[PDB]
Amino acid sequence: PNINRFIKYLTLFLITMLILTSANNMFQLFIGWEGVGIMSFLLIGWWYGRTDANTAALQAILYNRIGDIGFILAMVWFSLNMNSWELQQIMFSNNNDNLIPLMGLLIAATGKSAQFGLHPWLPSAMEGPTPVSALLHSSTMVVAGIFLLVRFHPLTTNNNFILTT
Amino acid sequence: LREHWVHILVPAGFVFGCYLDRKDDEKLTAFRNKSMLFQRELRPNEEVTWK
Amino acid sequence: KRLFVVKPSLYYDARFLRLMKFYLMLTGIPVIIGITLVNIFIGEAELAEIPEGYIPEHWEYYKHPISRWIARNFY
Amino acid sequence: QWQEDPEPEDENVYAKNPDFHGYDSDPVVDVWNMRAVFFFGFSIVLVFGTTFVAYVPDYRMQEWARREAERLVKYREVNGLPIMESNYFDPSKIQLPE
Amino acid sequence: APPLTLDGIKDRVLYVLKLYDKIDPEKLSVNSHFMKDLGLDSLDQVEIIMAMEDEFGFEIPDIDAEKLMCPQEIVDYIADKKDVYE
Amino acid sequence: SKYKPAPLATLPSTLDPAEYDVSPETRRAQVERLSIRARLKREYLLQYNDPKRVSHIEDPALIRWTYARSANIYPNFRPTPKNSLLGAVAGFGPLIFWYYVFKTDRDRKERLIQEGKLDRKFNISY
Amino acid sequence: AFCAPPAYLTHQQKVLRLYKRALRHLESWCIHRDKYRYFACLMRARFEEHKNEKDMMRATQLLREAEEEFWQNQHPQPYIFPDSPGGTSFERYECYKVPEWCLDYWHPSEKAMYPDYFSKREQWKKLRMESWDREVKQLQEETSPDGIMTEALPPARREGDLPPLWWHIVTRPRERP
Amino acid sequence: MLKIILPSLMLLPLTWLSSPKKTWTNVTSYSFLISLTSLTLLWQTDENYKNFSNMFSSDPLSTPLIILTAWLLPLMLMASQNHLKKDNNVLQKLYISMLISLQILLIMTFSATELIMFYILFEATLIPTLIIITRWGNQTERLNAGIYFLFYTLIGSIPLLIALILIQNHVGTLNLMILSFTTHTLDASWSNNLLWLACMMAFLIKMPLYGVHLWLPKAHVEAPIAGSMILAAILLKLGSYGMIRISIILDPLTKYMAYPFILLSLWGMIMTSSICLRQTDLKSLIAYSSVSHMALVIASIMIQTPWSFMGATMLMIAHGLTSSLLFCLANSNYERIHSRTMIMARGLQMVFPLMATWWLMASLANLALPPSINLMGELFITMSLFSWSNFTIILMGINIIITGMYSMYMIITTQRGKLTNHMINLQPSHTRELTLMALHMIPLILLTTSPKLITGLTM
Amino acid sequence: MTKDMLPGSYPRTPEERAAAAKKYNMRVEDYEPYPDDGMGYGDYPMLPNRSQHERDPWYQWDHSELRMNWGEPIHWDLDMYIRNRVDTSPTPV
Amino acid sequence: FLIALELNNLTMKLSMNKANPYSSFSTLLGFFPSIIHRITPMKSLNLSLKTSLTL
């Protein structure tokens, strides 16, 4: 009956995914980064009378907040050692030792892309309706972590510890 | 006007308050046009820089 | 056959939303038109150089007509 | 036991007035109380209060300070001066302990 | 799928029973008791309910399976479960 | 083979030795439990189906639980050696641990600023 | 779901329940219907075998042994019907099962769109009230003098009487609202 | 400020001289028009603070707080209107009077230019607040909550009065501008260490600091709705506002004296957040949520960096609107089932779909979803706390995870699952209850578009 | 609600055990207080540590989500054992 | 693919399938959910009540 709320949420996810991918600074990344996190919660828990949907939705949130620590770790580091969150200014960090920020981004990518250690939440997200599974939890939301590390590739190229991990 | 007069209570308070602040200014003019930063010569028909 | 669907009383949630939007738009739309005609017609003050000798009024230090007008009268 | 009223029962606020707004038990006083909150709350404060805040100019000199920094960054670049000096106060004026 | 109607349920219940071997179709009516008029044992009636769940696509809990002892009782238990009223 | 239980993986009902007990003493336990269960279920239903009800059905079992877990803890608390040690460790244990992490870190930081051995290269906000 | 459980399962109930569980798990391993039919007949051979052993102290020891055998050859992931407990559709529509009493707060302008549904509803609310007194009375008359009680309920023993405590069963929301 | 104060003093005669059928309309209409006038304070086109007289003056720290106070008065009147409908007329007018009196004192408290004037006003707020919790509270425990609230404050506040007198007996004045422009470094002697605690413990209790916070969960769990709204939104921020104001004259002792209190806040906030996971009372879950947010505010003020102050000011305003919105929402259920147990009512989204939207938005503000100003505070406090030391990220990382759990667990428990269908008294949400939530949420959204207004003094 | 319908202090005598059991709707042979280490339990029943996932799913529980019945005593850690959280059900392995 | 065909075509044989540790591990997601989602939330939620709130 509430089909056109379901349509609206999918639209909101798309917007929070286009915010994430075209962001020019870490803060606007975080709006999409956290926004798809919420939009996943509401769609995985579409059938909110089902107790296993609500547990799978809270489970997605819990793992993605464990990866928020990584994102926030990287954000504080750049605002302190580069005075900026913009990707242009972060580029002049190519000759620093970006272990701490790049560990943060690797943990955020680990949680957001369901990598080993933080992976259960992806098979559990299959509670939601199939259109949700196709859109979010396979072909957009889950590539955010991979997409993140592509943005910061100019830094990870000079770290063998991060590459090897 | 025996059950609607109460609407001058608060509007009167504002007017009385605005006037009470105009006095606080009149009391604190000891440095009017004397600061090292804004002191200037008085224009033709200018009696005070501010009121 | 079409069956009845038991629902919560939605009349009240819908009533609030309508009333909220009525009063927000009651002065918002007049304000918007007001703000839009002020930018279309009066325009924003241009930057100049203080001519030697002239002492600008305090309010002549802001661009927008709405801010210059508020500044001129109340402050 | 002691003399005491029984506990008053669970009333339905919509039973008698189906358009009850939440403010008063009397319908006429009730609607005008809803109307007042929406008018002074949304039409006046939120609309005009938001507008008055959007047109406060040069808020805390956030605008003047930029206009002034551009003037200084120009003047100093053409005249060969440093964009910004290391010392704030001139070393001439500072008599240090000997 | 199409709605379930009381006659369509009744037709599918008997249809499943007529393909059962230990039952003999010629003496199989809706009122046939499974333990008296057909001589089936406990361990069969369990398989009969299992065959109904597959037929209709939903489970009958064991607290209720052990009382469905005639085709009408099965038909009425399915009908009441799926909000079928004519 | 065989299944070894644990608190987070209990024993299945079908593997419970005490679930195939049939001696008459147990069967009478299991019949009084049902009678207590049915007596309450009957009372809940006599309120749920009542047409003159106009409010919800208050739950004494839930009132007792919430009261047992707040207003009734302290009166039923008696200091003992195990409580006092547990509160002392729980109370100041973590607080002392962190004090040395931060104090040690910031002393290494203040040491490295007096000898200039830090790279605050582009840092202008704090 | 409809029938309240007994105080305790009998031996007869504990063996039938196992039989059904053991077949459903077989079907989970076998998948293929021909292969599932073959082993399901072998399974019945193992239950017909000791069908008559009426020792009643080794029948039990034949059940605990067989449950401990089931628990080792479980399917780690048995098939579940979508609407059953643990099923993927289980409780999917519970967010669409509004209680009938929510209509008692409907605005009149809402009730004005279904004048004939809302007229066949005040009849049901009348029928519920007139019947209530006689329902409560019948439940005391059958309150057994010994406290021993069961969750079951009595029917209507008379004419013009609905069975006691019938409103929350008759009016319950549809399984697929 | 006398144009914000005098009209507010007139809501007291207006409360009493109005008709019985006009008291609630009249007062709540003029409260809005008073919070409009307080926007004049925002006309700050320069870097000089507004000094109106020898008594009052507004700063970028005292203006957001002043406005939040004035805007909250009309909100609390509407919140208190349905649970006071059974009281005779003089009790309603006596309740309205105690709420107005708390708005007048609070505005004078933030605009005061001298510490002694701040202290007296900062103590006067106990009277209307003690009367509210005790006279109009609901349970028998309201009597023990009034004592806990009254004497935690007073015990902390006596040393502050002593210390303020010592400051004046030595400096000659308590004016905040003069003490700023003539401040002398303190020696590290054992007497000044005590002067520091004397000047701080009063405000650290009101925050509250972890350890000495048991008054807050007691006060909230038993106050009427408007008691919790003012407590969680303004009275806690008296502590924060005081510490910022008086810590200028306490240097350099804050570089070491603060360690015990940075550690109680950083560790304490984890203890309080984890409590919200196992808290069986909904009004109690929010109150501990407040304790764990104020922990960051305490921690950030103790390190005195431009970012940390900026984050704390934003978090003060953000928490002011958010905690109040949560208390109003929990009250809306409570005014239907008269039970505070969180698990008693479930699946309420089925019958209150719109009120379930406000729940979601309040809950998302509480767990600091970007770009809300709740995150800006948490984020800028983290940035400063990282620079202070790098291992604070360990504790703030944890607290962020726990904050997500108890925020969503709050939403999942009460708004989802199956409906508790025996609750036939779940009436449709009142237009009044929904307006109350829109008034909390709209300003919060507007302040996100213009964060400049709540950056505080440093930025 | 009165003092004797509410939890109390640890039951010292068997006469105050059968009083406590009757309060909580339990059999006297089933009532079992927590051990008296003075950690604040008083006389609240100590019930087996089974999460609500183990309750009969097919029964029509009064509190449907919690899988409880009205009046039944509630485990001390219920909110840790609801179906959204910790599961203690038997595992195949 | 080739390995899959052979393996999936033994399921057509009238020979019963049995549990082994390797398929149990595969079917039960390496037991990572069955452990981590039981032990970890228990210890944390048990601390939330016994240590923080109560003690």
Next chain:
Amino acid sequence: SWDKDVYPEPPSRTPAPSPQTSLPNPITYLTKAYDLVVDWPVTLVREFIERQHAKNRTYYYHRQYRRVPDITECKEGDVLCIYEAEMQWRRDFKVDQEIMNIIQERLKACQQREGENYQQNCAKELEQFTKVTKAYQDRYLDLGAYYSARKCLAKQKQRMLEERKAARQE
């Protein structure tokens, strides 16, 4: 418009199109149709507005702030002269925040346009950032939340002494 000295911008060097395929560039078509259907109607709407803004031409000025005595020229305790020295410094300190932003805009604006040659062709902007940062750190770093002129002066005197003690040995 904007001053091209505050915001330097290398001139654009677009190679002239060299189309050696028979096919039509679909970019160059939707660009024509975009100019006729989007660009042209909009420019009329803007030309209409600027003809109104010409009829009501108004002026505003940048405020001049003469220089007042420094903090160094203030007797201790004289709050009258400390207050003006403190206000001036806060104005100065704020203009320095905006200078830093301008120098950051350039570095960000260069990083984008140089693209794959930023490590080489963005040296001058990275050098001004590295220099104007050292000055900023030498003026304002570690002052704290309650920063003021007197702390700025105390920090400078403590640094002029730590450097004088460099040559007093060397």
